[PDB]
Amino acid sequence: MVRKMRIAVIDYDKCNPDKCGHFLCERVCPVNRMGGEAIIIDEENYKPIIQEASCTGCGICVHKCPFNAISIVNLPEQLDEDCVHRYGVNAFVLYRLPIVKDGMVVGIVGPNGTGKTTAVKILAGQLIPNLCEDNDSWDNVIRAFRGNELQNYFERLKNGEIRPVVKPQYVDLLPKAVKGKVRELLKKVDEVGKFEEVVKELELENVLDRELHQLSGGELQRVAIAAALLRKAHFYFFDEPSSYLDIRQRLKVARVIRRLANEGKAVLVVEHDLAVLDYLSDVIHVVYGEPGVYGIFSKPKGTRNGINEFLQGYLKDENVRFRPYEIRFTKLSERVDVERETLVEYPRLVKDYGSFKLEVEPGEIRKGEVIGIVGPNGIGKTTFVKMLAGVEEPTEGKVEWDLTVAYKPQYIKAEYEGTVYELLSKIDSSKLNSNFYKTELLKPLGIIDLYDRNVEDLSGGELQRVAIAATLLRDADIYLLDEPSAYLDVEQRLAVSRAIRHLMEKNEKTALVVEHDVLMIDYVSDRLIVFEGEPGRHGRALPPMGMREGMNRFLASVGITFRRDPDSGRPRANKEGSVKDREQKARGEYYYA
Amino acid sequence: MEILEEKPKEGKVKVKAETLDDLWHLYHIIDPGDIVYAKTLRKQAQRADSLRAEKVEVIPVFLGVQAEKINFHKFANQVRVTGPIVYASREDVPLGKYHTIAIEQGTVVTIQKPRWKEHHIERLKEAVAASKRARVMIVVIDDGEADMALVREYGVEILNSIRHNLGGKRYNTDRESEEMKFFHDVAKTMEEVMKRENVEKAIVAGPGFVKEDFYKFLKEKYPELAKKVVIEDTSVTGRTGIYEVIKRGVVDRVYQENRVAKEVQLVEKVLENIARNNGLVAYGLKEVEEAVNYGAVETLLVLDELLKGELREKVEELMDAVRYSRGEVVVVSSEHEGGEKLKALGGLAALLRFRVK
Ligand SMILES: Nc1ncnc2c1ncn2[C@@H]1O[C@H](COP(=O)(O)OP(=O)(O)O)[C@@H](O)[C@H]1O
Ligand SMILES: Nc1ncnc2c1ncn2[C@@H]1O[C@H](COP(=O)(O)OP(=O)(O)O)[C@@H](O)[C@H]1O
Ligand code: SF4
Numbered sequence: 006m007v008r009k010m011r012i013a014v015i016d017y018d019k020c021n022p023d024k025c026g027h028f029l030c031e032r033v034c035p036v037n038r039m040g041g042e043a044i045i046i047d048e049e050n051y052k053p054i055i056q057e058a059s060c061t062g063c064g065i066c067v068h069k070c071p072f073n074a075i076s077i078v079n080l081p082e083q084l085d086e087d088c089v090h091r092y093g094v095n096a097f098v099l100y101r102l103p104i105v106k107d108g109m110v111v112g113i114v115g116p117n118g119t120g121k122t123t124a125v126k127i128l129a130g131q132l133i134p135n136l137c138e139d140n141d142s143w144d145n146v147i148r149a150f151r152g153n154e155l156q157n158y159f160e161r162l163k164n165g166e167i168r169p170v171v172k173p174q175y176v177d178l179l180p181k182a183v184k185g186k187v188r189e190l191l192k193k194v195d196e197v198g199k200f201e202e203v204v205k206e207l208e209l210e211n212v213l214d215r216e217l218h219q220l221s222g223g224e225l226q227r228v229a230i231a232a233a234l235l236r237k238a239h240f241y242f243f244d245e246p247s248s249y250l251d252i253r254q255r256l257k258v259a260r261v262i263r264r265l266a267n268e269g270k271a272v273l274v275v276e277h278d279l280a281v282l283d284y285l286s287d288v289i290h291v292v293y294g295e296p297g298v299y300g301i302f303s304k305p306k307g308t309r310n311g312i313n314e315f316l317q318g319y320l321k322d323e324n325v326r327f328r329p330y331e332i333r334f335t336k337l338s339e340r341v342d343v344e345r346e347t348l349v350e351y352p353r354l355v356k357d358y359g360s361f362k363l364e365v366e367p368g369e370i371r372k373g374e375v376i377g378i379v380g381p382n383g384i385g386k387t388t389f390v391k392m393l394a395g396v397e398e399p400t401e402g403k404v405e406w407d408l409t410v411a412y413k414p415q416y417i418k419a420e421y422e423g424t425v426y427e428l429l430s431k432i433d434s435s436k437l438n439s440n441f442y443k444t445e446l447l448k449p450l451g452i453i454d455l456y457d458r459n460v461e462d463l464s465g466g467e468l469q470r471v472a473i474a475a476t477l478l479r480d481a482d483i484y485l486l487d488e489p490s491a492y493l494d495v496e497q498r499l500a501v502s503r504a505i506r507h508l509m510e511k512n513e514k515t516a517l518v519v520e521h522d523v524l525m526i527d528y529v530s531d532r533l534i535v536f537e538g539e540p541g542r543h544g545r546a547l548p549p550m551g552m553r554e555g556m557n558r559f560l561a562s563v564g565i566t567f568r569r570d571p572d573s574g575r576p577r578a579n580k581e582g583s584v585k586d587r588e589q590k591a592r593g594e595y596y597y598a
Numbered sequence: 599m600e601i602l603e604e605k606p607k608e609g610k611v612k613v614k615a616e617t618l619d620d621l622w623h624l625y626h627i628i629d630p631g632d633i634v635y636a637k638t639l640r641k642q643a644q645r646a647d648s649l650r651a652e653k654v655e656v657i658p659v660f661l662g663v664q665a666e667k668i669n670f671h672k673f674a675n676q677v678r679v680t681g682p683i684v685y686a687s688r689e690d691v692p693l694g695k696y697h698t699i700a701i702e703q704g705t706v707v708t709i710q711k712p713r714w715k716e717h718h719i720e721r722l723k724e725a726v727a728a729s730k731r732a733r734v735m736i737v738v739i740d741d742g743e744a745d746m747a748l749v750r751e752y753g754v755e756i757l758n759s760i761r762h763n764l765g766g767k768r769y770n771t772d773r774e775s776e777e778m779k780f781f782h783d784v785a786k787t788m789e790e791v792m793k794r795e796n797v798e799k800a801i802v803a804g805p806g807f808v809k810e811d812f813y814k815f816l817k818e819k820y821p822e823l824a825k826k827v828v829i830e831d832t833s834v835t836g837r838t839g840i841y842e843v844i845k846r847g848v849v850d851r852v853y854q855e856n857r858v859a860k861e862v863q864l865v866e867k868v869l870e871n872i873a874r875n876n877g878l879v880a881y882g883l884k885e886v887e888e889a890v891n892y893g894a895v896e897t898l899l900v901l902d903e904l905l906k907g908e909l910r911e912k913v914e915e916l917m918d919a920v921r922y923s924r925g926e927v928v929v930v931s932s933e934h935e936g937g938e939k940l941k942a943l944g945g946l947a948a949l950l951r952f953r954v955k
């Protein structure tokens with residue numbers, strides 16, 4: 006048997022006809038060579054267009070494109086009949102949708118730019134599906150999804166007796182769009198009559214006094230979680246709420262979102278941290294494809310199986326490979342943990358601004374290792390990191406030595422005129438051009454494809470990857486990253502992990518990665534700094550300690566114990582009040598790698 | 599085809615058709631203003647009463663038909679030429695009618711009254727009478743004789759019929775130094791013919807040990823030109839032993855496919871890697887037309903369907919010019935792993951020696 010359609014997508018935001026000669030396409034194109042119309046020129050909007058009705062799918066044009074603004078795929082003709090939306094020819098296409106459901110929490114996992122957000126607009130009444138045809142009605146949608154639960158969704162959606170509220174993929178829009186306080190706002194947006202429960206469970210009663218612009222990450226995020234629920238809506242769609250929440254927060258916010266299911270309200274969630282995902286969801290979707298060419302949502306799965314299958318890279322329900330190797334993790338017995346040479350040591354420091362107090366106990370820094378920083382936000386993880394960084398001078402003690410520090414700040418904002426390549430190039434041209442930084446850093450984080458746009462003209466997730474890469478291409482003794490986790494997806498999060506681990510181990514250098522995402526910690530960490538006290542008041546930084554002994558020490562203050570999943574190997578969070586929860590906590594070992 | 603030219607003026611030729619391409623040759627020569635005589639059969643229609651009833655008939659023998667249209671038909675493999683009769687037997691008086699006929703296998707005479715051109719006589723002789731080849735090189739080596747044949751569609755002949763004059767084991771042990779001598783001779787004669795005819799395998803077959811015995815000796819003597827042993831069926835020798843080896847032995851057809859297929863994909867890989875090199879790839883009617891005139895094309899790879907396209911003339915010329923320049927031109931099935939990419943590439947791909955812009 007056989008059957009096959011060709012599908013061409015050109016990321017125009019990457020095409021530039023004047024730089025590659027004169028549309029390198031039509032020139033290099035074999036079909037056009039022999040008097041054909043595979044690639045046509047839009048001599049007006051000045052773009053190239055591939056008439057899929059021709060294109061043999063030989064892929065010559067793809068290899069030639071000086072950038073990589075072309076993708077040509079040969080489909081078996083099947084998924085093509087389940088086609089949802091095309092943004093015009095040579096443009097992004099969606100196949101299938103996530104199946105939302107009442108009274109249940111429908112999970113989503115899968116890398117950015119695969120039209121997670123495309124589906125949200127579709128469901129929000131603000132975009133009619135064309136079903137990759139020409140449609141501008143609901144009725145063909147309702148038919149196409151006949152045999153499935155989403156027909157019923159589009160019928161209600163059109164009567165307009167449901168409207169979903171959406172927590173946007175980037176936040177930090179509400180501070181520059183909505184002025185005055187968190188106190189104020191939360192009265193205004195109120196319509197659900199559940200004001201009391203929300204503000205208390207998400208612990209924003211201290212956070213009312215400050216204005217939006219004065220918030221820290223964890224707080225701003227949570228205040229959006231609050232204001233979305235106080236708007237009246239049955240359907241709540243959270244895109245990336247894991248941004249900037251700490252370990253303590255993200256587990257507690259998960260409980261808050263889960264309590265919605267019991268109230269019988271429909272939650273749809275994107276999460277990129279498997280422990281948090283396991284815990285919330287009841288259905289799970291995998292989304293596969295290469296970003297910006299196509300995305301296809303898989304069939305709904307039961308959370309556990311769905312996650313297993315994501316890790317394997319092979320779908321047994323759909324028969325699709327989408328990653329040619331497996332997601333994997335590092336215990337502590339899959340390493341050599343041997344002692345190394347002391348780089349520097351720091352005595353007792355104590356910094357008091359007079360609006361937070363920190364005491365740092367005496368500690369050793371070793372060379373060649375990767376230290377993870379853990380604790381809840383405002384516990385002065387950041388105050389410590391900034392004392393070595395030079396932006397803050399210790400009140401007492403010394404950390405500011407003849408180590409050079411490379412500093413990735415907590416927020417990201419751009420102030421740089423010129424391209425991604427200008428910005429990096431002036432730091433160390435040399436590094437950019439070597440094969441290691443190309444295998445480990447630049448190439449898998451997409452930066453080769455990003456050199457053409459300005460820094461200001463990059464979006465949050467691309468720009469994050471760009472900041473991270475920048476900080477590690479600085480020439481330093483010791484590398485300081487404050488919270489790189491924010492706006493990274495699962496695959497990205499992992500890629501940054503393998504890059505940090507390799508680069509630091511090879512040149513035997515120190516890095517501090519302030520961390521809160523379970524998986525990155527699980528792979529990268531050699532040693533740990535657990536923070537305690539009461540946040541927003543006092544923090545006590547306890548000296549560096551082993552990875553296991555640290556996650557043990559800390560997990561016991563969160564009530565939440567972690568196992569090792571037996572299906573394919575991942576961090577398994579155990580429900581507070583379970584067999585494993587009870588066995589770990591009784592036996593003083595609160596964690597396994 | 600097989601040609602016999604029976605008259606020095608081409609007033610009598612005797613021609614045949616065995617293969618699809620032979621007919622295309624026969625088409626290409628035959629025009630308006632020829633008469634072909636042949637040897638068909640055209641029937642009558644008779645008789646009848648006072649009025650009209652049922653009844654028909656048939657007859658046999660040759661004839662000639664004038665050329666009035668020249669038409670070429672698929673799923674039939676037959677070139678029809680229609681129009682008026684002018685030669686028949688008269689014993690019944692059956693003249694006074696037209697009569698279509700088809701040029702096929704068996705005798706077909708061609709003549710042209712204003713008299714043929716150089717191009718016409720040349721076209722005929724272009725297809726080679728003896729054998730154009732396909733492999734067409736089979737051996738059978740048994741205790742009593744060594745045999746070795748050239749079996750083409752155009753005719754069929756055991757090339758060597760030399761005798762061992764010896765047993766396998768029956769006269770004594772027969773592991774003579776006149777057996778060692780014999781085998782060396784056998785190998786030599788086969789080696790010289792195989793190269794000369796330019797088809798590169800032979801199938802050895804035989805009884806008992808003997809077939810194997812010989813392959814072992816060939817490999818041990820010199821590195822081969824490609825040799826395979828197949829068991830096949832043998833339990834006779836002479837014309838019918840060679841004939842029996844060929845009949846159940848789709849070995850011939852299957853091997854000839856695998857060898858052509860090999861050549862395309864070897865070249866295919868090369869084109870991939872050359873495309874990276876600046877100015878040494880040609881591809882794309884204009885580019886290829888441009889190297890071929892400047893005489894710098896090493897290899898021309900074209901799927902056979904493009905030869906039978908809608909533009910056919912250009913393709914042949916590009917090949918003709920390259921072959922004259924001592925490139926090699928490759929004509930290959932589109933079923934193949936390499937052939938399917940020459941469709942995609944568009945049709946023409948060529949490897950250059952040196953840059954043509
Ligand atoms: N309005 C748009 N016009 C053109 N392309 C878009 C648009 N919105 C998103 N895309 C492209 O669609 C792809 C997937 O989009 P998105 O839904 O934002 O992905 P995800 O949520 O997985 O990050 C990306 O490559 C993105 O650039
Ligand atoms: N210059 C300052 N003056 C007064 N308070 C400050 C100053 N800088 C930071 N703070 C306060 O210190 C507390 C902790 O700060 P920080 O170390 O940035 O926390 P985190 O753990 O979230 O990184 C916050 O309550 C913050 O408002
Ligand atoms: S798609 Fe690539 S090669 Fe074609 S015009 Fe755009 S930039 Fe040039």
Ligand code: SF4
Nearest residue numbers: 043060061063064066
């Ligand atoms: S894939 Fe091949 S055939 Fe299709 S547009 Fe590109 S070069 Fe032309």
